[PDB]
């Protein structure tokens, strides 16, 4: 996250931190995700497409820091890794960039709700906030485009939803952006998601409830003028989600 604020998991209790194990025992952070039911985390396919072996991954819930054990955190293995079969990556855009991870602790249990572990609601079909609405994004991604390391502390920021009409302008993304994607940015281009934030939640207070409106997918750079963050539009994938869940 470029700009924004440091935060803690209590403020973002649906946030899932996804890591990959390597042969020698080292673990590296991969992507974010969101807990949508006790057994299911939703993320982005592009995070996993090159290494689709579910045994390689670890999922933490209730975790505020990248490389430390926060009190009340829960560690999970991935029981099923489901990537979208129509995922594709073009010049700029990632299409159908959505994935599901069925999580299970070593004892075979799903998430236990607590102050630091809560599910986030899904939207209803084709039901998104109006353009101009403020939404929050959360992640352990880069704080600057030139960083090669991720911050140890979880961050959040607040961005505004951008119309499809604006986002498909030539100096924005043109025809690369589709109706199954959502654009969001800072009006002054000072805060944005970045590399390492992929898979994590774009959350909007919708109709009296915190709702998973988007999934961090792609963008041209980070916090660049006229280059919004692009998010998988969750409200256009409900048949897919419920079919696998």
């Amino acid at each position: 996250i470029i700009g924004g604020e440091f935060t803690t998991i209590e403020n973002q209790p649906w946030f899932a931190a996804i890591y990959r194990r390597h042969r020698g025992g080292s673990v590296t952070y991969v992507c974010g995700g969101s807990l949508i039911s006790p057994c299911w985390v939703i993320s982005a396919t592009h995070c996993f497409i090159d290494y689709p072996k579910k045994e390689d991954y670890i999922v933490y819930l209730g975790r505020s820091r990248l490389n430390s054990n926060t009190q009340g955190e829960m560690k999970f293995e991935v029981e099923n890794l489901i990537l979208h079969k129509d995922y594709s990556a073009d010049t700029l855009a990632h299409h159908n960039d959505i994935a599901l991870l069925k999580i299970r602790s070593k004892e075979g249990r799903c998430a236990q709700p607590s102050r630091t572990i809560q599910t986030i609601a899904l939207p209803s079909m084709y039901n998104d906030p109006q353009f101009g609405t403020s939404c929050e994004i959360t992640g352990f991604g880069k704080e600057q485009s030139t960083d090669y390391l991720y911050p140890e502390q979880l961050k959040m920021t607040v961005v505004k939803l951008i119309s499809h009409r604006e986002c498909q302008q030539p100096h924005y993304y043109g025809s690369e952006v589709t109706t199954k994607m959502l654009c969001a940015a800072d009006p002054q281009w000072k805060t944005d998601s970045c590399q390492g934030d992929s898979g994590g939640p774009l959350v909007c207070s919708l109709q009296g409830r915190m709702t998973l409106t988007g999934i961090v997918s792609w963008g041209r750079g980070c916090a660049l003028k006229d280059k919004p963050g692009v998010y998988t539009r969750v409200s256009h994938f409900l048949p897919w989600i419920r079919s696998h869940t």
């Binding site: 592009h46 855009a93 961090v216 997918s217 792609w218």
Partner: peptide
Amino acid sequence: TCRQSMCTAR
């Protein structure tokens, strides 16, 4: 094949 989407991925 290098594609720019490798770099746009967040």
